[PDB]
Ligand binder design. Structure first.
Ligand SMILES: [Mn+2]
Ligand SMILES: [Mn+2]
Ligand SMILES: [Mn+2]
Ligand SMILES: [Mn+2]
Lengths: 362, 362
């Protein structure tokens, strides 16, 4: 039964009067409508036993009532005090409101207190996070579209680097984001990374206007937003023939990531999935250089639940989405990472990106 | 008054004990420290008669003394509770705090209340907007740098559309932003607009993957961020030879804009600046199709003060920075806008951009 009926069940169980939801991502997940309120006010109000209302600026009202359903919509003009309009549409005794503690600024809560009195505010964010851990088949299709665009990014990026003739890290970044803009993509899901040689072992490194080094490795970490959903992936290639040491580090990381991918299925635990990759790299003598958890969740944002880390005994179940991204980073010498995100099926998993994992030579 | 002296005199006049300033653009504006703190806590604290203090995360502590002087800097470890460090470091009594009411979220004012008690909060933002309304000489150099980048975008945009061969509005936008990226520009200051023929008359049109039209006009509205400051301009050209109706509409807009630039100087009012261009368009027979104010302010953002609009009797002063952008939009037929931003000198004004204003044919 619907997300809205789940939130309304929460309110009765905890004896809270209504919500006032403000985050534009949450608003899109819950209503289907992507709204950019910027400076003005917009809120979603859900009750224990009454029709949910949706309060927007006067200009967005008609757009909103063609592209949502089940909602009671009304608005306000710059000539009005918005909290007075809201007050004129709620005629009950409000003594508690559920809001999102990390998003709602002081002006909104004070403006709200000025009408309904001395409110007791309750945090709604933990329940929203929990509803997002399991994805529907409809959600997984959209994330598959974002994955296809991440695969095109690699082909364009490898080809741009192989032309040499003075090409730099920033030159390659710009060319990649040029092609995505041409195909209609609205933005990247995080800052695009292209790092040459020893520069790939720095955890704070950033693409700059430095020429890529011959006979060294090149790291690409990238991702896009499409239809409100995200993608994330990493691949490490070679520019000319590398030396024997750097090719052996790449083999270790490669086999470690494929072993975690052949192990994931419902019934195992997050701790166990981290351990497959980490034990393999530790047994080979490079444990002190794999210094972060194996993976993180993904969905509308690039960083959600669950956490694939030690000490987490959560049971993996069908529908979850998360990243699988081991690495070895050795300062001044070399750094390598290989990354996919995936979704969990009834007897296994499938990955969102398909580009080759081997050490290709350009 | 230095900027710090100005905040503190405010506190003595209003009987407030101290500040907790949190927005990173404000932080940069007041001290020269530009940091991106994500979810960790940073705060600037000024007093009525006592040395200012600055609270940052344990990382940023010594990159903070790189860029600031005269401030007692100190930090906190991820294993610590930040508001506790703040409470044990402030050894005077606090019952009231000045903050930025639009920026500071609920979790942070509740974190402060649990350490200091029942705080009375007071809004500092009206004062920052009054300090930002007049620009210093150093601020104007940086805005000129951002304006030159906008002239370079026009050179690139005209050339790309001259090539024809099926090029579209969205092809043209991608090439503009590609080139800015290669030069190290962090981002644009708003969504770039390229609109062809009758599509420029839509008040809500947007670049799309459709071929530009021969023998019609083409509109370019664009700007960048550089060094923490913004820019904004518009030009309108022709693709092939235009018709006589569209060329006379361009001439009317050209003269209206140039007329307002020769009028602006200290002493006149904002209402009078709007009327100079508006009367010219009205007397030529198209007043019904000039349906927005003549300009807005510019600085760190593109949406600040003063407002150039009927009814605003504010007096213009040396050092104010605003836009000058009349236009005519006739549904189904044509749209033209021409736009510069400017700074007011001791006896006139000067423009931030220099690209030609005439109707050029590519
Ligand atoms: Mn990644
Ligand atoms: Mn990742
Ligand atoms: Mn403007
Ligand atoms: Mn503009």
């Amino acid at each position: 039964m619907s997300k809205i009926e789940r939130i309304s069940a929460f309110l009765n169980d905890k004896e809270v009067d209504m919500t006032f939801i403000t985050n534009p991502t949450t608003l899109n997940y819950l209503t289907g409508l992507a709204i950019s309120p910027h400076e003005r006010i917009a809120g979603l109000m859900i009750f224990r036993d009454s029709t949910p209302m949706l309060f927007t600026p006067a200009l967005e009202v008609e757009k909103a009532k063609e592209h949502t359903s089940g909602l009671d919509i009304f608005g306000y003009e710059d000539s009005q005090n918005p909290w007075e309009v809201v007050k004129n549409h709620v005629k009950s005794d409000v003594k508690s409101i559920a809001v999102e503690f990390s998003d709602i600024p002081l002006a909104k809560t004070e403006g709200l207190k000025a009408q309904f009195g001395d409110i007791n505010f309750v945090n709604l964010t933990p329940l929203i996070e929990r509803m997002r851990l399991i994805k529907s088949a409809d959600e997984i299709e959209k994330m598959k579209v974002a994955g296809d665009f991440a695969d095109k990014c690699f082909e364009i990026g490898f080809a741009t680097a192989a032309e040499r003739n003075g090409v730099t890290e920033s030159d390659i970044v710009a060319k990649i984001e040029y092609e995505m803009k041409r195909m209609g993509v609205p933005q990247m899901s995080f800052d695009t990374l292209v790092l040459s040689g020893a520069r790939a072992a720095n955890p704070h490194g950033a693409p700059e206007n430095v020429e890529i080094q011959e006979n060294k490795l090149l790291l690409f970490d990238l991702g896009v937003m499409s239809g409100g959903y995200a993608s994330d992936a990493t691949r490490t290639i070679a520019i000319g023939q590398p030396n024997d040491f750097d090719a052996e580090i790449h083999k270790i990381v490669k086999e470690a990531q494929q072993a975690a991918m052949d192990f994931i299925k419902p019934g195992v635990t997050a701790h166990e999935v981290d351990a497959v990759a980490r034990d393999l790299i530790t047994k080979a003598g490079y444990g002190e250089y794999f210094n972060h958890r194996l993976g993180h969740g993904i969905g509308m944002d690039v960083h959600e639940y669950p956490s694939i880390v030690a000490g987490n005994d959560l049971v993996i179940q069908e529908g979850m989405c998360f990243s699988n991204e081991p690495g070895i980073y050795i300062p001044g010498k070399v750094g390598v990472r290989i990354e996919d995100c995936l979704y969990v099926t009834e007897n296994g998993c499938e990955s969102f990106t398909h580009t080759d994992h081997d050490l290709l030579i350009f």
